[PDB]
Amino acid sequence: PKVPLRTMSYKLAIDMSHFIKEKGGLEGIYYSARRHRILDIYLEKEEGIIPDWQDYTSGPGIRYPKTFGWLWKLVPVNVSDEAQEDEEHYLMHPAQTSQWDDPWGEVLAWKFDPTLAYTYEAYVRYPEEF
Amino acid sequence: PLRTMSYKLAIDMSHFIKEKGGLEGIYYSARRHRILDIYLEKEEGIIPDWQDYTSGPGIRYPKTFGWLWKLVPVNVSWDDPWGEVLAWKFDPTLAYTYEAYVRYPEEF
């Protein structure tokens, strides 16, 4: 039936990290609050993961996942050339995020990082965010 | 991972694009043609050998069976060798009729 709820432990975070990768992964997909909550619902629905686990550090640059074992961090994506990323947008995806949705103005995309299983960067670098 | 544009892929990419703002009603140009080429080469690794449209005056039909987009003239009363403004129009019946090959097999 429905998977019983369970919190994302360290081992579960790794297994879910690879489960999402095997499902195609999130590489290079642009981050967003809506995509964030969609990811949350996907793991509750298919795997019963209580969705109190997906959070990222806030400083500029890499946004490290605050649950240790989650291997999908956020990275800033480089400036889009004036020509022709705006014509590309009109042509294909006319509905764009505003970069100032992020407090640092940075456009964020998911990136996979296996080393995040061996260093809890979020807590090692920014303990004050806990 | 370059992959070539199959029928099922053309259907899906047709739908993905149409789902979003997509190409609907947008003025066609040789520039915008290549931009679409790149955006698909990059975002899905599709060799850009698929997006051709039949030549003559009138509606231009896509030469990849499964690509659900054609080019339609806009009434008004230039880039086009026939003297027409062209616009992208989604058309789901191209899933079931290879109009390009039916009407103009010459171009194959």
Numbering used by the authors:
A (entry chain B): 104 to 233
B (entry chain A): 107 to 183, 203 to 233
Paper lines:
The Nef protein of human (HIV) and simian (SIV) immunodeficiency viruses is an important replication and pathogenicity factor. Nef-mediated internalization of CD4 from the surface of infected cells is highly conserved among primate lentiviruses and thought to promote the release of fully infectious viral particles and to prevent superinfection. Nef stimulates clathrin-mediated endocytosis of CD3, CD4 and other cellular receptors by acting as an adapter of the adapter protein machinery. Our study thus provides insights into the molecular basis for the versatility of Nef as an adapter protein for the internalization of surface molecules containing endocytic sorting motifs.
We were able to improve the crystal structure to 2.50 Å resolution by using an N-terminally truncated SIVmac239 Nef starting at M87 before the extended acidic cluster in SIV Nef. As before, a synthetic peptide of 16 residues comprising the cytoplasmic dileucine motif of CD4 was added to the crystallization screens. Again, the sorting motif of one Nef molecule in the asymmetric units contacts the hydrophobic crevice of another Nef molecule. In this structure, the electron density map was visible for all residues in the dileucine-based sorting motif, providing detailed molecular insights into the interaction of Nef with endocytic sorting motifs. Additional density of a helical conformation is visible in a solvent channel between both Nef subunits. This sequence could not be unambiguously assigned as only the main chain of two helical turns is defined. Upon binding to the hydrophobic crevice, the ExxxLM sorting motif of SIVmac239 Nef forms a regular α-helix (αL) of two turns ranging from E188 to M195, thereby ending with the last canonical residue of the internalization motif. The negatively charged hydroxyl side chain group of E190 aligns between the two positively charged guanidinium ion groups of arginines 137 and 138, forming two strong salt bridges in the assembly between the sorting motif and its recognition domain. L194 binds central to the hydrophobic crevice with contacts formed to G128, L129, I132 and R138 of Nef. Of note, no water molecules were seen in the binding interface between Nef and the sorting motif, indicating that the side chains of L194 and M195 sufficiently fill the hydrophobic crevice.
